[PDB]
Amino acid sequence: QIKDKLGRPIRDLRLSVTDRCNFRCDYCMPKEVFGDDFVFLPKNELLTFDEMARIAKVYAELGVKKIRITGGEPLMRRDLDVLIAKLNQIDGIEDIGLTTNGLLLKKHGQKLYDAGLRRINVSLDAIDDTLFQSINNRNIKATTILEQIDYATSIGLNVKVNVVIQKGINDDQIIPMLEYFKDKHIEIRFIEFMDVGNDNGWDFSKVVTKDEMLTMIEQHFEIDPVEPKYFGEVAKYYRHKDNGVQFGLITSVSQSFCSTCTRARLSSDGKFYGCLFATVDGFNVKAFIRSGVTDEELKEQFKALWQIRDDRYSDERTAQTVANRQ
Amino acid sequence: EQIKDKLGRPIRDLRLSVTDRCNFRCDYCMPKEVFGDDFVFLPKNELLTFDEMARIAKVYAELGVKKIRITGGEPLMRRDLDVLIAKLNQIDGIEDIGLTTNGLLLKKHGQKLYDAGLRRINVSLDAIDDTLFQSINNRNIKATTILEQIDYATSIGLNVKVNVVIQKGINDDQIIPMLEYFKDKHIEIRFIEFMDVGNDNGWDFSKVVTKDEMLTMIEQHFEIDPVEPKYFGEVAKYYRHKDNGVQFGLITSVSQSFCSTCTRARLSSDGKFYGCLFATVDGFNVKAFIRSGVTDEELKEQFKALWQIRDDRYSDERTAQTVANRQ
Ligand SMILES: C[S@@+](CC[C@H](N)C(=O)[O-])C[C@H]1O[C@@H](n2cnc3c(N)ncnc32)[C@H](O)[C@@H]1O
Ligand SMILES: C[S@@+](CC[C@H](N)C(=O)[O-])C[C@H]1O[C@@H](n2cnc3c(N)ncnc32)[C@H](O)[C@@H]1O
Ligand code: SF4
Ligand code: SF4
Ligand code: SF4
Ligand code: SF4
Numbered sequence: 126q127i128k129d130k131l132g133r134p135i136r137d138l139r140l141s142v143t144d145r146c147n148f149r150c151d152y153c154m155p156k157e158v159f160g161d162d163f164v165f166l167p168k169n170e171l172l173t174f175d176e177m178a179r180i181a182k183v184y185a186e187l188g189v190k191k192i193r194i195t196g197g198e199p200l201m202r203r204d205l206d207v208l209i210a211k212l213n214q215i216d217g218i219e220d221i222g223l224t225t226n227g228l229l230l231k232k233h234g235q236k237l238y239d240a241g242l243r244r245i246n247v248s249l250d251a252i253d254d255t256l257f258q259s260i261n262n263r264n265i266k267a268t269t270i271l272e273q274i275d276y277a278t279s280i281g282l283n284v285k286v287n288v289v290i291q292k293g294i295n296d297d298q299i300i301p302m303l304e305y306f307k308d309k310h311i312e313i314r315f316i317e318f319m320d321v322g323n324d325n326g327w328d329f330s331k332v333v334t335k336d337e338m339l340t341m342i343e344q345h346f347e348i349d350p351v352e353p354k355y356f357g358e359v360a361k362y363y364r365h366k367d368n369g370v371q372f373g374l375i376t377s378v379s380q381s382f383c384s385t386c387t388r389a390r391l392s393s394d395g396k397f398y399g400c401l402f403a404t405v406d407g408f409n410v411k412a413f414i415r416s417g418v419t420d421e422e423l424k425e426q427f428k429a430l431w432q433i434r435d436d437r438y439s440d441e442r443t444a445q446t447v448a449n450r451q
Numbered sequence: 452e453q454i455k456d457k458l459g460r461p462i463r464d465l466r467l468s469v470t471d472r473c474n475f476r477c478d479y480c481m482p483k484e485v486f487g488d489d490f491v492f493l494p495k496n497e498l499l500t501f502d503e504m505a506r507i508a509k510v511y512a513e514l515g516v517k518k519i520r521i522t523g524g525e526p527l528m529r530r531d532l533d534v535l536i537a538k539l540n541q542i543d544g545i546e547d548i549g550l551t552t553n554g555l556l557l558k559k560h561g562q563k564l565y566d567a568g569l570r571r572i573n574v575s576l577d578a579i580d581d582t583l584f585q586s587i588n589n590r591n592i593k594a595t596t597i598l599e600q601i602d603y604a605t606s607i608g609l610n611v612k613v614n615v616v617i618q619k620g621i622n623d624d625q626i627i628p629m630l631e632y633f634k635d636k637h638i639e640i641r642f643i644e645f646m647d648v649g650n651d652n653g654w655d656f657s658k659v660v661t662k663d664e665m666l667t668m669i670e671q672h673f674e675i676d677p678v679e680p681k682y683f684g685e686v687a688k689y690y691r692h693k694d695n696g697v698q699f700g701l702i703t704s705v706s707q708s709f710c711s712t713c714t715r716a717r718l719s720s721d722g723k724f725y726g727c728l729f730a731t732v733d734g735f736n737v738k739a740f741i742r743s744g745v746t747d748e749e750l751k752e753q754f755k756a757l758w759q760i761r762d763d764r765y766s767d768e769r770t771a772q773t774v775a776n777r778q
């Protein structure tokens with residue numbers, strides 16, 4: 126069994142499938158930076174679906190059970206159903222999820238379902254249509270994505286919703302969004318906003334922690350804690366007492382979780398990373414694969430990359446924050 | 452003035468173990484089968500002296516230690532413990548000195564300790580029913596005796612908190628009676644998840660009651676709200692009674708391990724340094740180091756080196772092995 130320097134196994138391959146996106150969310154792909162001038166990866170500089178499938182097969186043999194399709198906005202990747210069909214035929218792979226702004230769900234949703242997609246995570250940072258647009262800078266209304274969510278649900282997809290909260294910006298959406306998704310029996314998850322400051326610890330200025338979110342929510346809702354489904358479950362779940370619909374809170378910053386992190390990551394340009402943060406360019410899997418290698422030489426290269434992994438960025442910021450309290 | 456270890460963690464707390472002796476034989480700590488008649492405890496001269504401890508505490512205060520916890524063993528068994536408290540009370544930079552005790556000897560020594568500057572104690576008490584408690588301590592001590600010690604300690608002006616380790620099948624039926632009793636005494640109680648490493652070798656949950664489960668038990672008898680953390684990376688998760696307002700704590704030693712904020716150095720009763728509560732091998736011989744003849748600077752430089760190479764994270768390792776054993 127394959128474990129890194131901190132004793133963590135490989136479970137979870139995050140597959141980035143494009144660098145492109147149809148939103149320009151102020152904190153992720155700001156319009157300044159990613160303007161009209163931006164040149165994105167060309168077609169041939171992305172991994173093919175066949176190379177993706179090959180990589181996934183090899184990872185399955187090392188322990189990976191789950192694959193999360195991301196980008197970018199994944200639905201801009203043109204024949205995404207084809208990847209999903211190939212991923213769904215890999216034996217050790219048990220779950221495939223997709224993480225999306227949901228805009229293209231009415232165009233590509235049925236195709237993806239028919240290829241074997243069953244679960245999606247839709248990010249939506251407000252339910253107000255105005256405030257959603259000022260976040261996304263592409264004149265989309267939240268109402269539009271709500272309708273996409275309803276379509277996805279109608280064709281049999283399981284939908285969960287991810288909201289990153291910022292304390293001058295998203296503060297006040299917490300209660301309306303719980304009410305709306307409570308009614309629709311859809312699991313929503315509030316996520317603490319991550320931002321490292323000058324002192325190299327966490328910056329709590331635009332943060333609303335799990336514990337303050339929870340003070341807000343109890344004032345408006347009657348609620349019970351749900352016991353962790355399995356050990357090391359990341360999200361802290363709660364249940365509305367009247368109808369048992371669940372929501373979750375993700376303690377990105379106030380309670381870092383690197384010790385249970387089993388996530389390996391392939392960028393859209395085809396480079397291996399052991400963590401969502403990372404200064405240097407990672408191993409060039411794309412280059413390696415295109416210069417003829419056996420499956421066995423691929424497996425051993427991924428094994429060696431994992432066994433050398435000691436990433437724990439969020440825990441490091443956590444420790445530095447303790448140090449800065451002085 | 453601020454020293455960090457290999458995982459970015461500053462030194463902040465010093466646990467000083469002052470004896471290996473104890474007046475109990477708690478089944479999960481000093482079982483009588485191991486610590487019975489033929490056990491040999493440390494000779495007196497192999498303990499650190501109080502001067503050695505004060506000198507060690509001083510140099511650690513220069514490296515950023517702010518809190519000292521006195522423990523053991525049962526620290527009240529150490530003769531003239533009040534002389535140690537008095538020397539530690541004279542050290543610049545130390546803001547808090549705490550004692551953790553089973554409490555049995557608090558009537559005997561409490562006033563002396565108070566006089567010497569002690570103001571805070573943490574009393575370990577795993578049950579409030581007498582028959583049960585006797586079955587745990589294995590020395591025929593009644594919980595009622597410990598309760599009277601607690602009430603004397605508060606009366607002389609010590610601040611008392613209570614710690615309770617819960618093992619499923621043994622004392623988990625005690626969570627409610629103890630919450631009720633100390634709620635009415637305005638004393639903060641804390642429940643701690645039992646740590647036990649299984650064969651395999653992540654955590655053994657076989658009795659383990661988790662913080663989550665403890666809370667499901669608790670919210671039925673009492674109406675409760677969270678208390679937000681007083682500071683960032685506070686280990687205990689606090690709650691308060693809506694009545695009233697008395698706080699209690701729950702400690703997720705096993706279900707939510709917290710090595711990332713761990714700022715604890717430890718000296719054993721035989722005077723060896725440990726960077727963690729769990730250790731399989733002997734630590735650096737601080738005791739022989741200082742008895743070999745060293746300067747305060749040489750001492751400080753060694754403590755700084757011991758901390759800079761520290762990478763312990765036992766509970767997180769166990770947590771990772773647990774995730775890894777799920778396959
Ligand atoms: C990069 S998008 C990729 C998939 C798709 N475009 C989407 O947004 O659903 C994935 C997530 O990163 C999150 N994100 C970016 N920066 C973040 C930050 N500083 N703190 C918390 N989440 C962040 C966004 O909320 C988003 O849900
Ligand atoms: C070594 S005693 C020293 C102080 C004093 N003799 C007392 O018992 O309070 C310190 C603590 O270690 C704790 N402890 C020992 N083994 C434990 C375990 N497996 N899980 C949780 N706590 C444990 C005991 O409950 C006790 O409170
Ligand atoms: S939609 Fe997703 S990838 Fe695009 S700018 Fe927003 S968070 Fe970023
Ligand atoms: S910051 Fe920690 S939990 Fe997040 S991807 Fe990196 S190692 Fe994993
Ligand atoms: S009283 Fe404290 S040191 Fe003594 S056996 Fe019990 S837990 Fe251990
Ligand atoms: S197990 Fe972790 S939290 Fe506990 S003393 Fe060791 S390093 Fe610190």
